[PDB]
Amino acid sequence: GAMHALGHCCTVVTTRGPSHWLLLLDTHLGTLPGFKVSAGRGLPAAEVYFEAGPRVSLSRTDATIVAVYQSILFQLLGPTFPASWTEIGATMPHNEYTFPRFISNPPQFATLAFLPLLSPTSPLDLRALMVTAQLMCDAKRLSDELSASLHGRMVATPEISWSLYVVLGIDSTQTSLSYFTRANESITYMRYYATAHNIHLRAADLPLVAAVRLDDLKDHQIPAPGSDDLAPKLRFLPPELCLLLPDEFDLIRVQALQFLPEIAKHICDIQNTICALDKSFPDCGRIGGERYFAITAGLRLDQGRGRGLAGWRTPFGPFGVSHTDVFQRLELLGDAVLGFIVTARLLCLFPDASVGTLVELKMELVRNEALNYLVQTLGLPQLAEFSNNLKSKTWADMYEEIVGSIFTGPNGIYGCEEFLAKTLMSPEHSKTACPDAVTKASKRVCMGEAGAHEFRSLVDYACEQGISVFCSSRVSTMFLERLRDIPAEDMLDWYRLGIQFSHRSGLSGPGGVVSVIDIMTHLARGLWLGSPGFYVEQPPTIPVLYIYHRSVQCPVLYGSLTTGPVASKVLALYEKILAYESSGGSKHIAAQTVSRSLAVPIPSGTIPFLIRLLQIALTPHVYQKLELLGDAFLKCSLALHLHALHPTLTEGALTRMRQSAETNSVLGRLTKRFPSVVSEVIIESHPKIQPDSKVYGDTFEAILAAILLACGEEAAGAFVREHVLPQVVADA
């Protein structure tokens, strides 16, 4: 209509070859996921690929010049198609959508126009359109104009539904006057058209035409000047009813064009999917076409049905990866990121807890029985659709998939973390009168006018009522216990923070619902993502702040280190840990040596703190939790590095591969590649230890954590792809 014209380079491929087109959309739908179309309706199986182009503008005139070519197309497509892509699309029967059970009537309806292209690189020529359209307009009738120059050329029958055919050659063996037969009936051509279509031939004495109706021709190739490999479907028609199409409209071109209603339908499919389930599926950040495929992959647990997923068409992700495989490799990855988040946040939520109990709590939340509950609460099962022909499929899987999907979306870890906070903790996780002292204490809190003697009352009654805000029972129980250790005057900061999250996530106003469960939850959230660090039991409290190193910051919550209520807590630890008096001897020497032996560029002025975190990784009994964290991160890191490295592989492959480089022995050897000073301190702290010992692999994970903790994530990530990634053995 106006400048508004996003370009897309289509490529319709079939047995014969590729057909390119320039798709102009009046809307922003990011990149469009290709899709292949099964064999049927006269036309054979094919594949359609998309790929963003330039944002081509158009002067109203050029817009009318496009209109023309379009009508041409609509005419070559026949009467079974209304001259309007937008209409051809909005007429779609429900059974042809990716979610036929969730059809929405979106506000707008994209406008599309297809243009011919010689090569995926060729520019847009608005003048080449005239020439083209002219050719069509000045198209003679075969009876106006040898059988070797028409062989292969296309031609339709205007008076005959514009059906399309491919000229094979003039058959002088007979003429329109000739005869053909049926079981118990012999008729002349001329007569037939007069009887049926009720048309009166004029050049009845003209030599008939021998061509194959495009339908029948499905994918069969064209013989040579009648050697007629397979000629039973072959038919004959009056050169006068034949309108020879100009060279350009060659088979490839023609037939390829029979797959445009479908590209339109595709756009219609998408759009419909988007605004129908968009606010019903965990937001990933994606939009348009990618948000679509993302929804299909997460909601279409079963594969297409012969004909296809959404009609005859079946959308494939980058590298032609099925939505099925995508779900497979997003869960695998969601499982790991989810695992790492939990390990990190629990460490801080229970800085005094032991690894043992820290691992029990983890499962307590990452457990299938648990996630299968968060999924039920997310109302996903209802949207989940599939023909129960798929066997170890689980709801819980969907949770990890979403997590894996948020991460790879533009929202990333910041997204998974949010998704996580909301879901794992909720007032809907506990059951349910109350005294007066509590009710009044509730409101006062709802408006900050609440103090220390008002929260304790709230925690105790929530302590003696069995209030739970985690999908787990022990975790919840364990939670309330922590609060007991928390000084009342510190809880309002956790609240104002929890209530802060509930808001920017659109799941709550500026102020809480005014209930005790509600109140407790806002603390939970806040304490979940708020706690500064943990203790390395009998030597201070390690601060978890590898998140302030991320290139993108989120002050609204976390804030800055230059200073908030929460922010100040972490930094407090950070310094107190620098305020420690390094006993510098060897553990410090090894610590130093490891620092420069990273072969990785860590952010500046991050060294001193790193060294600290290294000595701790080196000293025995203390590296306990660091290892726990390293293990988790490493698992996440690798999965990622492989996920990117092998876009076509699935779970198993990806699993076996990363697990290969996680075994202690593997990690241990790495630990040895450090200048002996390291190996030395180990043996130093451990009497009569062996080269195949565990501590070797275990301290490595301890190190890895030390990098993440002090240098940030990506720094550690590079650490992994530089030293550990290389050790992954190939399935082959």
The amino acid that residue 130 corresponds to is M
If the CB atoms of residues 283 and 662 are measured against Mn ion, the closer one turns out to be 662
Q: Is 145 or 352 the residue whose CB approaches Mn ion more closely?
A: 352
Nearest to 365 by CA among 380, 352, 349, 351: 349
55 versus 621: smaller Cβ distance to Mn ion: 621
646 binds Mn ion (CB under 5 A): yes
Which residues are registered as beta bridge partners of 310? 313
Binding mask 386-425 for Mn ion (x = CB under 5 A): -----------x----------------------------
Considering only the stretches 52-60, 247-255, 285-293, 366-374, report the one whose residues sit in contact with Mn ion under the rule CB under 5 A.
366-374
Give the Cα separation of 150 and 142 in Å (integer).
Answer: 10
CA 64 vs CA 113, 299, 695: distances in Å = 11, 41, 75
In the list 662, 678, 709, 713, the residue contacting Mn ion (rule: CB under 5 A) is: 662
Would you say 210 or 341 has its CB closer to Mn ion? 341
Nearest approach, Cβ of 667 to Mn ion (angstroms)?
7
Joined together, the tokens standing for residue 441 give 């204490």
**Site string (299-318) toward Mn ion, x via CB under 5 A:** --------------------
Q: What are the tokens at 174?
A: 């007979």
> For residue 50, which amino acid is it?
F
Paired sense of beta strands 533-535 and 313-315, if any: unpaired
Stretch 455-484 residues interacting with Mn ion (CB under 5 A)? none
d(Cα 238, Cα 215) in Å, to the nearest integer?
19
By the rule CB under 5 A, 660 interacts with Mn ion? no
Q: Which is nearer to Mn ion, 113 or 277 (CB)?
A: 277
Q: Does 285 bind Mn ion (CB under 5 A)?
A: no
718: three-class secondary structure by DSSP: helix
Q: How far apart are CA 703 and CA 597, in angstroms?
A: 12
Choice from 282, 351, 532, 559 touching Mn ion (CB under 5 A): 351
Q: Tell the smallest beta-carbon distance from residue 705 to Mn ion (Å).
A: 11
Query: Between β-strands 235-237 and 243-244, what pairing exists: parallel, antiparallel or unpaired?
Result: unpaired
Place of tokens 């703190």: 609
1 touches 26 (CB < 8 A): yes
CB 47 within 8 A of CB 41: no
Rounded to the nearest 5°, which phi and psi values hold at 48?
-120, 125
Q: Which stretch binds Mn ion (CB under 5 A): 125-133, 167-175, 492-500, 634-642?
A: 634-642
DSSP per position, 56-124 = ----HHHHHHHHHHHHHHHHHH-TTS-S-HHHHHHT--GGGSSSTT-----S----EEEEEESSTT---
Residue 155's beta-bridge partner residues? 165, 244
Build a one-symbol-per-residue string for 156-175: x at contacts with Mn ion by CB under 5 A, - elsewhere: --------------------
> Which among 65-73, 223-231, 268-276, 359-367 is the span making contact with Mn ion, rule CB under 5 A?
359-367
Min separation Cβ 182 and Mn ion, Å: 24
Q: Which is nearer to Mn ion, 178 or 541 (CB)?
A: 541
* 87 vs 352, beta carbon nearer Mn ion: 352
Pick the closer one to Mn ion by CB: 554 or 683.
Answer: 683
For residue 367, the minimal CB distance to Mn ion (Å) is 4
Cβ proximity to Mn ion, 252 vs 384, nearer residue:
384
Least distance from Mn ion to the Cβ atom of residue 483, Å: 12
Please report whether residue 527 would count as binding Mn ion according to CB under 5 A.
Answer: no
> Three-state SS for 505?
coil
Query: What is the smallest separation between the CB atom of 165 and Mn ion, expressed in angstroms?
Result: 27
Site for Mn ion in 600-619 (CB under 5 A): none
Q: What is the CA radius of gyration of the chain?
A: 34
Nearest-angstrom CA–CA distance, 152 and 166: 6
Segment interacting with Mn ion, rule: CB under 5 A, options 249-257, 463-471, 579-587, 631-639: 631-639
Query: What does residue 129 show for φ and ψ, rounded to 5 degrees?
Result: -75, -45
* Window of 71-79, 247-255, 364-372, 720-728 that interacts with Mn ion by CB under 5 A: 364-372
**Nearest to Mn ion of 48, 649 (CB atom):** 649
Distance CA(540)–CA(155), nearest Å, equals 85
Q: With respect to Mn ion, which residue has the nearer C-beta, 53 or 647?
A: 647
Identify any residues that bridge with 185 across adjacent strands, giving them in sequence order.
182
For residue 257, what is the enclosing H or E element? helix 251-257
Helical segments of 350-451, H only: 355-366, 368-377, 395-408, 412-424, 436-446
Position of tokens 């194959």?
212
CA 408 to chain CA mean position, Å: 7
Contact status: 626 vs Mn ion (CB under 5 A): no
**Sole binder of Mn ion in the list 648, 663, 665, 690 (CB under 5 A):** 648
Q: What are phi and psi of 135, to 5 degrees?
A: -40, -55
Determine, following the binding rule CB under 5 A, whether residue 368 of this chain makes contact with Mn ion: yes
Q: Total number of residues binding Mn ion (CB under 5 A)?
A: 17
Position 647 contacts Mn ion (CB under 5 A): yes
Q: Site for Mn ion (CB under 5 A): which residue of 97, 249, 350, 633?
A: 350
Long-range (24+ apart) CB contacts under 8 A made by 76-80 are 76/156, 76/162, 76/164, 76/245, 76/249, 76/254, 76/257, 77/257, 77/258, 77/260, 77/261, 78/161, 78/162, 78/163, 79/161, 79/162
**Residue in 77, 634, 640, 725 binding Mn ion, rule: CB under 5 A:** 634
Q: Which is nearer to Mn ion, 72 or 310 (by Cβ)?
A: 310
Shortest distance (Å) from residue 649 CB to Mn ion: 5
Specify the residue, 359 or 438, whose C-beta has the smaller distance to Mn ion.
359
Segment near Mn ion (CB under 5 A), from 48-56, 368-376, 587-595, 671-679?
Answer: 368-376
Q: Does 428 bind Mn ion (CB under 5 A)?
A: no
Of 271-279, 434-442, 454-462, 648-656, the window that binds Mn ion (rule: CB under 5 A) is 648-656
Provide the minimum distance between the beta carbon of 178 and Mn ion in the complex, in angstroms, as a whole number: 23
Nearer to Mn ion (CB atom), residue 269 or residue 631: 631
Cα(154)–Cα(85) distance, integer angstroms: 23
Is residue 704 a contact residue for Mn ion (CB under 5 A)?
A: no
Query: Which listed residue (47, 269, 283, 631) binds Mn ion by CB under 5 A?
Result: 631
Q: Closest residue to Mn ion, Cβ-based? A: 352
Neighbours of 461 (CB within 10 A): 18
Q: Does 141 bind Mn ion (CB under 5 A)?
A: no
DSSP 425: B
Compute the least distance from the CB of residue 13 to Mn ion, in Å.
21
Q: Does residue 367 belong to the site contacting Mn ion (CB under 5 A)? A: yes
**What sign for the dihedral angle of Cα 431, 433, 436, 439?**
positive
Q: What are residue 47's DSSP bridge partners?
A: 13, 36
Q: Which two tokens stand for residue 76?
A: 């070559």
669 binds Mn ion (CB under 5 A): no
Q: Does 290 bind Mn ion (CB under 5 A)?
A: no
Could you tell me the smallest distance in angstroms from the CB atom of residue 127 to Mn ion?
A: 41
Round to whole Å and give the CA distance between 632 and 620.
20
> What residues make contact with Mn ion under the rule CB under 5 A?
350-353, 367-368, 397, 631, 634-635, 646-649, 662, 686, 698
